[PDB]
Amino acid sequence: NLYFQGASGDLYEVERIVDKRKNKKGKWEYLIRWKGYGSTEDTWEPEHHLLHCEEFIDE
């Protein structure tokens, strides 16, 4: 359950990671299949704007 976090702060739901690449600054980017969109809308996003979420367990 992945999400992209915008500069605005908002969270956008990710269907899946399509691909991965290293950028010119040596940092990882992921090709994002956005939930509700098709492959023509896939975009490369920086790793540090991606989040993984899980059901809350009081642990």
């Binding site: 992209f4 915008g6 500069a7 605005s8 908002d10 956008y12 975009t43 996003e45």
Partner: peptide, 4 residues
Amino acid sequence: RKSA
């Protein structure tokens, strides 16, 4: 990008 996405934002908004």
